[PDB]
Design a protein around this ligand. Structure first.
Ligand SMILES: [Ca+2]
Ligand code: NA
Ligand code: NA
Ligand code: NA
Ligand code: NA
Length: 426
């Protein structure tokens, strides 16, 4: 069959609308979401309202949030024609994240990286609008560094400066000023953010920061044209084959950007990465054709590689085969097995994604832990969300408490949305 990729793209943007924290705008399209977490603030009282909730919880996790933003923005820049008439909506969508990063950047060398204690947050089940627990905020500073989180945040802001150049130059300038300063913080104060924010080490443990130092430098090079950023990127070049592209590992993305700038080693590395993911490579294929990387977030890992493949094909890298692979993977997510893995879309979509707000009945009814375990479909449809997905033999359970199957997250949708745009321009 053929799929309505544009409808999915539009729903993905609505997923991000459903993840908004803070004071929502009057044109909020999600009728079951309202103002929430209005007291989010730093240890000096600084306003930290806004941003996206990470997943089915209410924590603001800076590393996946920033990677999501960078990745979304990359598609809006380089796959603009595919976005087409939805591009402006997509731009306004990601502004929510960018605004929040700028608030997090309270001073030159202090960057808030988390709002919410993941344990306390996950102990609650209910609407974000009705939270009453303490929501601690943790920052990165020279004595508690995080080159990974800071480098990714810098990348997002630099990518944003490119995206917004033409339509909102004053905003783009603000974004780039913060990007430069945040990147200097990341480069000058080396460390793993989840050692500095220990709460995060239970949820988004960072494996390494040098890949964010390369990625952020590449984005700043793209945003400024200043050679010093290429020189910095060259200090941190990807080594070997990336395991995947994700919130944790930036190497495959850096390979695409490096290839775009004429780096020959990177282009060969990118070819070697892609061929492993194509059929008959080193990546496991399920019997129904999903390129399956890991137990957790299998659809996300495939979508992320589909996005890389589409962008690589724009550089003339394994062009046709890359596009064939991307389409096959997207088609698995949308319906090729006979059901959709995108909430609110297609044939037999997931009805019970693991998401607190979606699980709740309409206001003014109470919502609590009984809503986590109810076998009924979620009362609210989390349109657009890509679920965790199946195991290595295509088995999947639409159970709200099967975390492996039915997790939803900002990062799960980020490559996915761009890959939809990329397919739309073929
Ligand atoms: Ca990393
Ligand atoms: Na708009
Ligand atoms: Na250590
Ligand atoms: Na490596
Ligand atoms: Na093989």
């Amino acid at each position: 069959a053929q799929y309505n990729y544009r409808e999915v793209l539009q729903k993905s943007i609505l997923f991000y609308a459903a993840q908004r924290s803070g004071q929502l705008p009057g044109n909020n399209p999600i009728d079951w979401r309202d103002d929430s977490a209005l007291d989010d603030q730093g240890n000096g009282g600084e306003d930290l309202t806004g941003g996206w909730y990470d997943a089915g919880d209410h924590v603001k996790f800076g590393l996946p949030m920033a990677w999501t933003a960078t990745t979304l923005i990359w598609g809006m820049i380089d796959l603009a024609n595919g976005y087409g008439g939805d591009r402006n909506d997509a731009m306004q969508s990601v502004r929510w994240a960018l605004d929040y990063f700028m608030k997090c950047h309270v001073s030159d060398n202090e960057l808030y990286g988390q709002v919410g204690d993941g344990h306390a947050d996950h102990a609650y089940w209910g609407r974000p609008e009705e939270m009453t627990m303490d929501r601690p905020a943790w920052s990165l500073t020279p004595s508690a560094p995080g080159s990974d989180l800071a480098g990714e945040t810098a990348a997002a802001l630099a990518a944003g400066s490119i995206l917004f150049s033409d339509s909102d130059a004053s905003y783009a300038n603000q974004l780039l000023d913060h990007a430069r300063t945040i990147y200097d913080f990341a480069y000058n104060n080396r460390g793993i953010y989840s050692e500095s924010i220990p709460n995060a080490a239970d949820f988004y443990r960072s494996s390494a920061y040098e890949d964010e130092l390369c990625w952020g430098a590449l984005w700043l090079y793209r945003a400024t044209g200043e050679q010093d950023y290429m020189d910095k990127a060259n200090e941190f070049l990807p080594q070997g084959r990336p395991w995947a592209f994700s919130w944790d590992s930036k190497e495959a993305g850096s390979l695409v950007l490096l290839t775009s700038f004429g780096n020959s080693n990177a282009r060969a590395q990118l070819e070697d990465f892609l061929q492993s993911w194509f059929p008959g490579g080193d990546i496991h294929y399920t019997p129904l054709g999903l390129a399956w990387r890991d137990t957790w977030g299998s659809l996300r890992y495939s979508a992320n590689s589909a996005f890389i493949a589409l962008l690589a094909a724009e550089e003339g890298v394994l062009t046709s085969q890359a596009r064939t692979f991307a389409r096959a993977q997207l088609d698995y997510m949308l319906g090729s097995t006979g059901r959709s893995f995108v909430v609110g879309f297609g044939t037999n979509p997931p009805l019970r994604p693991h998401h607190r707000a979606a699980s709740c009945p309409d206001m003014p009814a109470s919502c609590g832990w009984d809503q986590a375990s109810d076998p009924a479909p979620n009362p609210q449809v989390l349109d657009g969300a890509l679920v965790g997905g199946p195991d290595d033999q295509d088995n999947y359970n639409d159970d709200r408490q099967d975390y492996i199957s039915n997790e939803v997250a900002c990062d799960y949708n980020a490559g996915f949305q761009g890959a939809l745009a990329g397919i739309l321009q073929l």
